[PDB]
Amino acid sequence: YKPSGNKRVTFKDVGGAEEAIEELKEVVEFLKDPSKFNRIGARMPKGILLVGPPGTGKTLLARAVAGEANVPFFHISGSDFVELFVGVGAARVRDLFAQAKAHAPCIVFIDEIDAVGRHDEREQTLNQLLVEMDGFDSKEGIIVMAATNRPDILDPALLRPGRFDKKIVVDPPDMLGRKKILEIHTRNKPLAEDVNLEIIAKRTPGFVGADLENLVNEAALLAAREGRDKITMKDFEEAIDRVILISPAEKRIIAYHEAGHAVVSTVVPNGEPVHRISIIKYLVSRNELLDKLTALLGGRAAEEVVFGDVTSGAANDIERATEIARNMVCQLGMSEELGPLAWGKLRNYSEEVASKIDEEVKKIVTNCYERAKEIIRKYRKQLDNIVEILLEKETIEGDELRRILS
Amino acid sequence: YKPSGNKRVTFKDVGGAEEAIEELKEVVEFLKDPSKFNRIGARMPKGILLVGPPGTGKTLLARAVAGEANVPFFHISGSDFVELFVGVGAARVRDLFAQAKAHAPCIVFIDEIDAVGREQTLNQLLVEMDGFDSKEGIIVMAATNRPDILDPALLRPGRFDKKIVVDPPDMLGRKKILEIHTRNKPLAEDVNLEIIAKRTPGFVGADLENLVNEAALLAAREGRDKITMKDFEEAIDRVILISPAEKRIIAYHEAGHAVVSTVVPNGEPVHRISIIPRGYKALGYTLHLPEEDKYLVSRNELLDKLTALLGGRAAEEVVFGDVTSGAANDIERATEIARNMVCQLGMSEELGPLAWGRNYSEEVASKIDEEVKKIVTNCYERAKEIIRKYRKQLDNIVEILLEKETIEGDELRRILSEEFE
Amino acid sequence: YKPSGNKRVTFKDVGGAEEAIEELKEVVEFLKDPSKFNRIGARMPKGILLVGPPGTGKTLLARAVAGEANVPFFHISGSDFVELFVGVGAARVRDLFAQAKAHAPCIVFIDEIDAVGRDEREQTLNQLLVEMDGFDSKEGIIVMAATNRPDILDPALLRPGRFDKKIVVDPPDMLGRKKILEIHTRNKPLAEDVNLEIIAKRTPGFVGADLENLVNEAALLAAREGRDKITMKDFEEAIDRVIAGPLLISPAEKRIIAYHEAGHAVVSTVVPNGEPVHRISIIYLVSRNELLDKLTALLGGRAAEEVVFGDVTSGAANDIERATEIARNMVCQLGMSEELGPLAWGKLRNYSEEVASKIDEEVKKIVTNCYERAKEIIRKYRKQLDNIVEILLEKETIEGDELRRILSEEF
Amino acid sequence: YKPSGNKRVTFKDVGGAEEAIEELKEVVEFLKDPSKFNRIGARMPKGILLVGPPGTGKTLLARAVAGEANVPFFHISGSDFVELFVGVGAARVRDLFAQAKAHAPCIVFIDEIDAVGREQTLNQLLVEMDGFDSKEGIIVMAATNRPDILDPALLRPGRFDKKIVVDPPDMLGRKKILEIHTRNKPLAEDVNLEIIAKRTPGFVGADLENLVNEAALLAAREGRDKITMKDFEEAIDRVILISPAEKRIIAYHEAGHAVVSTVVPNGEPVHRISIIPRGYKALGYTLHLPEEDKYLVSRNELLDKLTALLGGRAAEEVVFGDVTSGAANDIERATEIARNMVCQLGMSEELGPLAWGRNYSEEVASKIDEEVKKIVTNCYERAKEIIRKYRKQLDNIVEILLEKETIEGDELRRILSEEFE
Numbered sequence A: 001y002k003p004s005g006n007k008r009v010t011f012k013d014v015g016g017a018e019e020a021i022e023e024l025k026e027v028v029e030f031l032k033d034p035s036k037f038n039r040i041g042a043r044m045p046k047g048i049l050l051v052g053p054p055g056t057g058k059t060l061l062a063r064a065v066a067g068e069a070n071v072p073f074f075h076i077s078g079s080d081f082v083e084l085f086v087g088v089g090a091a092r093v094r095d096l097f098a099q100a101k102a103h104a105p106c107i108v109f110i111d112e113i114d115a116v117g118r119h120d121e122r123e124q125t126l127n128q129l130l131v132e133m134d135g136f137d138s139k140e141g142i143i144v145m146a147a148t149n150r151p152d153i154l155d156p157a158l159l160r161p162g163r164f165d166k167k168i169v170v171d172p173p174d175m176l177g178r179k180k181i182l183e184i185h186t187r188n189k190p191l192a193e194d195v196n197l198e199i200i201a202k203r204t205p206g207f208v209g210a211d212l213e214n215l216v217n218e219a220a221l222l223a224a225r226e227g228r229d230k231i232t233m234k235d236f237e238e239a240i241d242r243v244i245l246i247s248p249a250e251k252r253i254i255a256y257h258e259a260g261h262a263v264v265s266t267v268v269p270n271g272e273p274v275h276r277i278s279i280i281k282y283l284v285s286r287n288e289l290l291d292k293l294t295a296l297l298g299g300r301a302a303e304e305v306v307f308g309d310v311t312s313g314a315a316n317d318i319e320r321a322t323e324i325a326r327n328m329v330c331q332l333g334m335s336e337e338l339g340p341l342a343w344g345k346l347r348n349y350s351e352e353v354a355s356k357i358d359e360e361v362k363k364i365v366t367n368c369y370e371r372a373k374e375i376i377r378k379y380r381k382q383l384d385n386i387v388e389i390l391l392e393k394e395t396i397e398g399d400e401l402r403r404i405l406s
Numbered sequence B, D: 001y002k003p004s005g006n007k008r009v010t011f012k013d014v015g016g017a018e019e020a021i022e023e024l025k026e027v028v029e030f031l032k033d034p035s036k037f038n039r040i041g042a043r044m045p046k047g048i049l050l051v052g053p054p055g056t057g058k059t060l061l062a063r064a065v066a067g068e069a070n071v072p073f074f075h076i077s078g079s080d081f082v083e084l085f086v087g088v089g090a091a092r093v094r095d096l097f098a099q100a101k102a103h104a105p106c107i108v109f110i111d112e113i114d115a116v117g118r119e120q121t122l123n124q125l126l127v128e129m130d131g132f133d134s135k136e137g138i139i140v141m142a143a144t145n146r147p148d149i150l151d152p153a154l155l156r157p158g159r160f161d162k163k164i165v166v167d168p169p170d171m172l173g174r175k176k177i178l179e180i181h182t183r184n185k186p187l188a189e190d191v192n193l194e195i196i197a198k199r200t201p202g203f204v205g206a207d208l209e210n211l212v213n214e215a216a217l218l219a220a221r222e223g224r225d226k227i228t229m230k231d232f233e234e235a236i237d238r239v240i241l242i243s244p245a246e247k248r249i250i251a252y253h254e255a256g257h258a259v260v261s262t263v264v265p266n267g268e269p270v271h272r273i274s275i276i277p278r279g280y281k282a283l284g285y286t287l288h289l290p291e292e293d294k295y296l297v298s299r300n301e302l303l304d305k306l307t308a309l310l311g312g313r314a315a316e317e318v319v320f321g322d323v324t325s326g327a328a329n330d331i332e333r334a335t336e337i338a339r340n341m342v343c344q345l346g347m348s349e350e351l352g353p354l355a356w357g358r359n360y361s362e363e364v365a366s367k368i369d370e371e372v373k374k375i376v377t378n379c380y381e382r383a384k385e386i387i388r389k390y391r392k393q394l395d396n397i398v399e400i401l402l403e404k405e406t407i408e409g410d411e412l413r414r415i416l417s418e419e420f421e
Numbered sequence C: 001y002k003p004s005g006n007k008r009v010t011f012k013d014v015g016g017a018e019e020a021i022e023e024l025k026e027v028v029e030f031l032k033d034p035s036k037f038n039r040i041g042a043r044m045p046k047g048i049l050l051v052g053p054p055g056t057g058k059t060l061l062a063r064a065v066a067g068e069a070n071v072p073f074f075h076i077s078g079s080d081f082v083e084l085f086v087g088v089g090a091a092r093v094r095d096l097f098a099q100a101k102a103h104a105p106c107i108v109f110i111d112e113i114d115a116v117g118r119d120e121r122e123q124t125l126n127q128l129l130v131e132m133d134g135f136d137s138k139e140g141i142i143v144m145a146a147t148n149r150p151d152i153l154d155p156a157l158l159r160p161g162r163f164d165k166k167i168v169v170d171p172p173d174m175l176g177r178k179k180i181l182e183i184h185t186r187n188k189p190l191a192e193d194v195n196l197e198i199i200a201k202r203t204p205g206f207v208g209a210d211l212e213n214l215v216n217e218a219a220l221l222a223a224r225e226g227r228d229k230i231t232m233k234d235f236e237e238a239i240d241r242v243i244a245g246p247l248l249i250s251p252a253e254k255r256i257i258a259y260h261e262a263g264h265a266v267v268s269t270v271v272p273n274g275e276p277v278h279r280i281s282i283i284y285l286v287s288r289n290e291l292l293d294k295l296t297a298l299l300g301g302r303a304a305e306e307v308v309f310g311d312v313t314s315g316a317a318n319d320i321e322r323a324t325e326i327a328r329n330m331v332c333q334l335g336m337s338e339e340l341g342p343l344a345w346g347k348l349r350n351y352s353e354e355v356a357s358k359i360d361e362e363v364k365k366i367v368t369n370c371y372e373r374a375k376e377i378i379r380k381y382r383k384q385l386d387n388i389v390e391i392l393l394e395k396e397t398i399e400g401d402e403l404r405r406i407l408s409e410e411f
């Protein structure tokens, strides 16, 4: 167990993970100079858990932190510890941490943690991990980062405060994100001037960083195979087939549905501000609830208006919307005719009341539906622009959207 | 869990399924050394779904694959998870796969997969499926005679994306199965398995294995050392078809599904139709399969799908003037879809974009029924307009069907095209 | 199972929880020296149940009691027991208590008890029951358990001889938030502009966990900019952060809650058979008239809402439930209805839809009448209503000879 | 089952129940040597039913009897049989009595006897009761605060044919109970149990034992060796009555039951009335007791019994103009009897001699409700005619009741006679 002798990486080498980079920048500030936190009692987490599917750059990330703070990086694999003789596992964990302390500040990284953080010698090995986590002085500038695509496997003792109580979700990249990852893995290659990375991004939905690096490589091998000294656009185009889904008709629909939720939310006075759209309170008032119900129905409202047809897409929204309305009527005393009474809780009321409840509930949801439809029809052109962008980029930010709603 | 200690089997021991053996020979080549495929990027399926009626050797083939690759075989049963306490189901799925990997390469078999694939237990299954590395030499196989009941999420790519249909065996296939289960039995000279295969129409492997045992018993009863032909003749009658007027109806029912599906604009492409009593290759079954390609479905798609479902019955009524029990399952499926349109998808006129479900009044209960009946009826009457309008094509397709029994690929498409060009 | 290896704490580390601390003082003295009680046969409970929302310091109090008594503390989580294989749970409980006895006096603390005490879970719990019944209080063992989900507990756990004593741990009001900040600040360098009062006042809804995190987020903001002191701006900004990471009460909402609570207060006072009202805070044989009064008061918060703001909020949902429980009980049990007569309707309903319909009407009529009567009262005493709210928004909690007199000067 | 290993108790340890001790001193004389009674044919009861509210020392007395006769004591709990699987209940009753006889003479105690005496489990109990030989020195004792709920078959002669009522203790009785639970405790000189008894109205034994413990705890908390008077004062407030306008109402309610019962021709003789908060000696409770004398009951008897049940409420309304929750249990009992008349006894006009019970239509459900309401209402209005007609007597009975609190025997009868002669 020694400082990794692999190539230095920084955040300049990670594409499509800005949210995560931002969370890790404070960890980097800390490794470069722990005293700035220590002297005012700013406590950092001892363990950070990176969650995400394979090849999304969980490891890259860990390595970038180390490289950016210019600090050693210990890379361990959790699948190493399975299958060990009796005791050997604990002893390795002990030695790992002993080393980490000799070399602090530093990052200790445990890949595929689920493999050890899960019924025999694993107990021993894991218990030791737990003891060492509890054991080390954060102030020393030690941070253990851990990665998994399988977080529901993990022994909850690992996620307890003082341990791995910071999770950072690392998702598959959107279209811009994939464009950046191509930039990165292309830095050092000879590209022809016809290579359009945006188009390649557009044509690689679902690809993760690991897939894109592969694609670039297949591009390069293709040109090389043919005795050429620049990689061209036809090479990347051909490559994509090599490293290899959802209709474009279906993409359209999803986009309008999502744009729908967003437009209504924005327009409705009490809506929830929209932080992001993607195609991959304590007290609450009557008006608040109606504005939310209405937003909830916008997806469907936008399908009906734009396509005339409706899809199964809004099943969950309808359930949600209905639930709210039933609650307004039976628990929150917010109905016209039924009064400030609690109807139900099962069913402790008559068929006459059962029927009134259904009318009121129907009345509320129908009224909200229509309202959503008016908003969509009223803002059709901007809905269309939003969709126009959303289809291209896959995700769009609120500030942008509110803008387009000029 | 602990791998099967049941006697190893090879394809040597499976008769009447040469088509299926074919497709699985690759899997065996993979299990024996996954490195040859790995090295050049040959990506195998993570899941294979065995479809066919009971006693057709689904379980057998699975084990034949495992024996043929001399790899361990985990047999799990689908009905062993239903009925379990809170969580037990998931943790058993967990354990399953934990074992699978420790013994890779290996085959995990999940019989009666419909039992689990109709919350927690499945969700877990799904996550394991996508969680394991194909390249480690793990292939999960599953069987079902109820493919129509499975959650469409199981058939998504990266899961049970390939499926093999295992049919009841015809006369020649029955003879082979008889020969296999008679290998280590003492036959009289007079015994002619040929005639026995001919005289056992409809029998599957399981039933034939059973007939054979019943023959042995007749011999033993009398204290004899050779099983005679009389013993086989007599046995058939202990275990105990279709008429050339009933053949017709089946023909018209299946043609029906075909014609409506072709004509209706959102219909499911038709790749094969068949009148083999219970082959799961028929279109009648296919129509009952869950959508594996799309996530979204539109109201018109459903109306078209509904109308195809009722095409078999539409045909029977138009052509025969009455109706048979044949369409029970189509009716049940049609009705589920209607209810779902109305109570979950908000696809009804009068009921609005509301989720109903019971949570609601008699007065609503009644509108729902009215609305569901309306949809199915209109769809039924559409199917009949179509049948009548395309009666000649219907007649022509039956004529062939009666003769050929099963129409499959490039040939099926010539005929639908000639007929609807 | 071993005693915890975390830092020993005391009541010097708990803030805003004086009532809970006072009930727990007995326990501390016991654990310091059980003989003192055993000497005169003062029987202590075997189990104390701490009830309250997440992050209010249920775990902290328990630790605080152990720390104050300088006795070992076993920290167990109920969430560990569910999901376990056949038997392993029972055997764990058995080990857990074996150790308890070998380290006694001591505290065994079971967080999230509702996870075990809501096949196999049955056995696991059964085993708990056995051990509880099975240990000698005299030997200085106390089992404490936490939950914010008490209604979900099996009543077997609450039997005498088991978890037969409960302490409720409330969320902190202004002054309590103030103290929690001072505590989590003891050892940190604050700028001279930092006013924890103001920050207290801006963090209604915040529990101890929330505030401690607040302070750490303030520290991280200073540290990130390389500053050697935490400033007011850091706390102010931190609030907005803790929020968007994982409920503050808005000022608009504070307003509504105030009127709601002031409403109950006003109606209760005015109504002849009202329940004396000892405190307001933002955070046998009864007669019909008594019941209509009680009903009227229960609806006062909602009435104050409707009258003052026009709108109504989800905030009266439980009051509505309770009011309805009362009206049904008047109609279906006490024979206090106009038209339904002196009959017991129900006991589970054993009556026609025709009656069920009359009942709903009669229950609706009672509640509606009391609600309107609540509004007549609010409107009639809008002035005093407004004065009570004004004060309440200043202090958040009004109590004692101070609430005593406010109600007098006003009525 | 195995006899109690709990500390032996004597009457020395039971305070405030001298009346009950009296009646049980005979039982003790019997247990110590059943031969003295046997020899001259003195037949003792086979069952004694202890009635009173919880924490009044019912269980205690049972054990006091057993300790005082130095005989074994089997404590069974009624709620231990409900919830048991098919048969388990009976076989446990069997075992119980099998043990009883092997250890005779002895006392079998069955707490919460209502729990079992509201099929198989009771039926078995009944047969054992009558199955065992009194003369073998076996007396079964049972307790309940719910005598009204018991099957009248338990109170039949040869069973629990004698019952003792245990009341909450008045001030003097509370003082004694305090003195007992303080015997082996270290009291400060200033401690005056007198004042404590006076300041604890309504407290039962259980509650007083508890107050005492709470005092000890206050001492221990502060590390003190004597429990002080402040400690008792403070304790009361930790554990925590009737008004002279509420006293009135209770008075009028109980008078009510009395007046209607006397006037109504089939009424249950009235032996005592009482306003002690919850003495089970009140007529209000008595009326709720099951008929132990007769097997048959006639429709008019029930109507009269129903009318007496509503007399308490009739009184409240007539005299006060409104009504209180006081009559909830009377209403519930009245209604059960009405339903029973209509759905089981065939005692309704419109419904005929039919058993309804649910097994029947909404349309019947409705007539039943109409009919039940009719009966109870008519009976209620009869009770009011009576109250109003006998208002003066009602007033007179209250006057006494307010003063004396409990009227018992020869005296009660003088006054009812003077008043209704």
Ligand SMILES: Nc1ncnc2c1ncn2[C@@H]1O[C@H](COP(=O)(O)OP(=O)(O)O)[C@@H](O)[C@H]1O
Pocket (backbone or CB within 6 Å): A013, A014, A015, A016, A017, A052, A053, A054, A055, A056, A057, A058, A059, A060, A061, A147, A181, A184, A208, A209, A210, A211, A213
């Ligand atoms: N976001 C990314 N930006 C740039 N390269 C990436 C990214 N994600 C993955 N890659 C490339 O693919 C390789 C595999 O990524 P890895 O860190 O092993 O992913 P994970 O740890 O999630 O399995 C990385 O070394 C990197 O070169």
Ligand SMILES: Nc1ncnc2c1ncn2[C@@H]1O[C@H](COP(=O)(O)OP(=O)(O)O)[C@@H](O)[C@H]1O
Pocket (backbone or CB within 6 Å): B013, B014, B015, B016, B017, B052, B053, B054, B055, B056, B057, B058, B059, B060, B143, B177, B180, B204, B205, B206, B207, B209
């Ligand atoms: N194709 C076949 N050839 C020979 N024997 C067969 C065949 N199919 C089934 N059998 C016999 O009958 C049994 C079929 O049962 P099973 O394996 O459960 O098939 P399924 O999964 O289709 O129900 C086998 O165990 C085998 O003994």
Ligand SMILES: Nc1ncnc2c1ncn2[C@@H]1O[C@H](COP(=O)(O)OP(=O)(O)O)[C@@H](O)[C@H]1O
Pocket (backbone or CB within 6 Å): C013, C014, C015, C016, C017, C052, C053, C054, C055, C056, C057, C058, C059, C060, C061, C146, C180, C183, C207, C208, C209, C210, C212
């Ligand atoms: N009343 C309080 N005073 C000081 N700190 C508190 C308080 N309540 C919570 N905390 C802080 O937040 C943490 C709360 O966690 P915990 O005690 O687990 O709450 P609970 O058990 O109610 O969920 C404590 O460790 C403490 O640091």
Ligand SMILES: Nc1ncnc2c1ncn2[C@@H]1O[C@H](COP(=O)(O)OP(=O)(O)O)[C@@H](O)[C@H]1O
Pocket (backbone or CB within 6 Å): D013, D014, D015, D016, D017, D052, D053, D054, D055, D056, D057, D058, D059, D060, D143, D177, D180, D204, D205, D206, D207, D209
């Ligand atoms: N009359 C009494 N005198 C002294 N102590 C009593 C008396 N009644 C009850 N107690 C105390 O309180 C407890 C009463 O509980 P229990 O025996 O169950 O009575 P019950 O059967 O009426 O509930 C007794 O165990 C005893 O310690």
Ligand SMILES: [Mg+2]
Pocket (backbone or CB within 6 Å): A054, A055, A059
């Ligand atoms: Mg990886």
Ligand SMILES: [Mg+2]
Pocket (backbone or CB within 6 Å): B053, B054, B055, B056, B058
């Ligand atoms: Mg089968």
Ligand SMILES: [Mg+2]
Pocket (backbone or CB within 6 Å): C054, C055
């Ligand atoms: Mg908690």
Ligand SMILES: [Mg+2]
Pocket (backbone or CB within 6 Å): D053, D054, D055, D056, D058
């Ligand atoms: Mg009792």
Ligand SMILES: [Zn+2]
Pocket (backbone or CB within 6 Å): A257, A261, A299, A300, A313, A314, A317
């Ligand atoms: Zn949606």
Ligand SMILES: [Zn+2]
Pocket (backbone or CB within 6 Å): B253, B257, B284, B285, B312, B326, B327, B330
């Ligand atoms: Zn069909």
Ligand SMILES: [Zn+2]
Pocket (backbone or CB within 6 Å): C260, C264, C301, C315, C316, C319
């Ligand atoms: Zn309220």
Ligand SMILES: [Zn+2]
Pocket (backbone or CB within 6 Å): D253, D257, D284, D285, D312, D326, D327, D330
């Ligand atoms: Zn009464």
